[PDB]
Amino acid sequence: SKGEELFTGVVPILVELDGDVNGHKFSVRGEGEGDATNGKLTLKFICTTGKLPVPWPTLVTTFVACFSRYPDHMKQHDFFKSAMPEGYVQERTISFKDDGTYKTRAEVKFEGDTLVNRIELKGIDFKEDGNILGHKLEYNFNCDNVYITADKQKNGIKANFKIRHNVEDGSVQLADHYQQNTPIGDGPVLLPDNHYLSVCSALSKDPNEKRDHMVLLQFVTAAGITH
């Protein structure tokens, strides 16, 4: 268990996403830092191709659970850090109710001293004037619990959870997430007992930034395992 030692201080983060949704090709670069000691993540994302063709909130879950704060009595259950520095693959299907689906594949690993989250995203079957491609979602975000379970068959973890995006007409757009994580390397990893991550995410804008962008502040704490 060397991996958790990489997270005792503040760690620079790079996020790179290549996306294609209904044939809209777009790219996003994010940078910031993670402080797992305090469960705190700060990142700013720029759409480097121009205007983002989906709403920023729909990409928040895709854009590093290794920065969760695992309490002392839960350190044997932190899969994410145990997979470092070689890292893990994070794969999701995100099914937007009555609309299209994202499939994402990401590699989360150290490159030098930077924690990198490199993502490929493919979105299909979206309604061209639905809530996603029609940009009908509010610019905000909730707190959520994400339940984590071991997937012993695959030496990894799984999770499934629902994100609720508020729509400009008062309704809610559901985004059902199914997630699998598997280590990149061969060394031992920790496979956890059932628990959850308590996640809170705040979105904002940089008043001096002219490009299409998102600022993300996120706090994550693991919970739910008893002494």
Swiss-Prot record:
Keyword line: Chromophore, Luminescence, Photoprotein
Effect on the protein of changing residue 194 to S: In EBFP1.2; shifts the excitation and emission spectra to shorter wavelengths and increases quantum yields compared to BFP
Effect caused by changing residue 172 to A: In mut2.1; shifts fluorescence lifetime from 3.03 to 2.50 ns
Consequence of substituting residue 68 to A: Increases fluorescence at warmer temperatures such as 37 degrees Celsius. In GFPmut 3; highly fluorescent mutant when excited at 488 nm
Matching InterPro entries: GFP, GFP-related, Green_fluorescent_prot
Effect listed in the UniProt record for changing residue 63 to L: In EGFP; increases fluorescence at warmer temperatures such as 37 degrees Celsius. In EBFP; gives rise to variants with blue fluorescence
Tissue occurrence: Photocytes.
Highest taxon listed in the record's lineage: Eukaryota
Function: Energy-transfer acceptor. Its role is to transduce the blue chemiluminescence of the protein aequorin into green fluorescent light by energy transfer. Fluoresces in vivo upon receiving energy from the Ca(2+)-activated photoprotein aequorin.
Name of the protein this chain belongs to: Green fluorescent protein
Origin species: Aequorea victoria (Water jellyfish)
